[PDB]
């Protein structure tokens, strides 16, 4: 009975319903992201169940503002809830403060929102990690908010089922030197290596960036660079 509600600590001060939501994210399709000096690139492997989807279906990458986006990893519907909240924060920043939301701020807001659903018996934690990619006045930034609401900045990041491998491949990259052009290639390449073929037979790799070439607008990358 220690593990049925997120309002409860176990005897070791764990919150199991959060660890469990965590597992939802780890059993999900893989995402990676890299924060360069010219921008952020985020890529994610969409696993279809049907051969008959439209290309575009179940986008896991959403813009949240002109300069920021969120790639979701885990339960896509839960993520669209976060994406909606991120968008409300971004709008608020523009409407009240007349400034684009800084990325650290956006990720904090996202984290606070996710964390809130780990405190109260009536809601459950979200089953998704959000990767936030911003390029506002704070510069290129890449955060991840996990279901606990813990938020961390990264140079590069990998989530989902192939996360342990994808991290090994992301460690081979030189983040000080790497550019958004190169990264679209590398990050996509990485998701092709770590994809398991005999399990998940149907897959595209969705990529998005926000960078100096995109006029610091967060956008899917044209499907010529992939």
């Amino acid at each position: 009975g220690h593990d049925q509600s997120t309002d409860v600590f176990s005897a070791e001060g764990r919150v199991f319903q959060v660890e469990y939501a965590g597992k939802a994210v780890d059993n999900s399709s893989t995402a990676v992201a890299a924060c360069c000096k010219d921008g952020v690139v985020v890529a994610v492997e969409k696993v279809h169940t049907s051969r008959m989807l439209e290309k575009g279906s179940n986008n896991r990458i959403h813009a949240v503002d002109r300069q920021a986006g969120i790639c979701i990893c885990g339960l896509l519907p839960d993520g669209r809830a976060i994406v909606s909240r991120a968008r409300q924060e971004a709008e608020n920043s523009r409407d009240i403060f007349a400034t684009p939301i800084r990325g650290s701020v956006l990720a904090n807001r996202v984290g606070e929102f996710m964390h809130a659903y780990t405190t109260h018996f009536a809601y459950r934690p979200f089953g998704c990690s959000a990767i936030i990619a911003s390029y506002a006045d704070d510069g290129p930034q890449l955060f991840v908010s996990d279901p606990s609401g813990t938020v961390a900045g990264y140079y590069g990041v990998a989530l989902g089922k192939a996360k342990t491998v994808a991290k090994s491949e992301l460690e081979k990259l030189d983040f000080s030197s790497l550019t958004c052009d190169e990264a679209v290639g590398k990050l996509a390449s990485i998701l092709h290596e770590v994809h398991d073929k005999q399990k998940d037979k149907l897959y595209e790799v969705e990529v998005a960036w926000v960078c100096d070439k995109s006029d610091r607008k967060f956008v899917h990358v044209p499907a010529d660079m992939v």
Binding site: I96, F97, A98, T99, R102, S104, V105, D137, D138
Partner: protein
Amino acid sequence: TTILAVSYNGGVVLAADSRTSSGTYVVNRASNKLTKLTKKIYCCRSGSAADTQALAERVSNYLGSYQTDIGAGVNVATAANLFQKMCYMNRWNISAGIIVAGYDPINGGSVYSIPSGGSCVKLDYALGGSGSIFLYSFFDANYKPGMSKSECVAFCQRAVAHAYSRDGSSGGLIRTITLDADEPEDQTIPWNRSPYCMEKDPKYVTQATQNQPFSSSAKITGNRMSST
């Protein structure tokens, strides 16, 4: 009230007279209408002291919260935007001309006018107060932009002095503050070192000739100063 702000390269000057009047009596002859919002962002307040003090305190509060939260400096645009919001939400219940001016490193020095209706307009300089109606021509005629800090301070002091020499509702001290990359410099010119007043302009020393003595001629001489 006379409030104004002017941009110079890299910052702003704000200036104001010091008088608060309940019509025709001066309740405060040393009010400070340059109100700090953040370190480098100020407003000048005109209209209802009550209203403007309440908004400034509210906006300053919000902006301090906001600065602590984003862990960085605040932009003048943010301060103006908030001010505008509040001024517009309460436009029917307040009398409030604001100028929000200050320095932020992204945009340099900025000036926003937020007049009674709650418009917010970004300008090179702004005037507000009952006394401002007297400075429009003064600026049109005598303000050249691109002034140094020090020139700009002196010019705003002159401008306030001119305004409050004619507006009965403005008077007293002239308070200024500059706001730029460096530390804010506040200044206060007391009335008796005002860089202009009518009581010391030589072209207003001769009295109008209204009280002519009874004479056998139409030739106007002077006022009758003595009974003999």
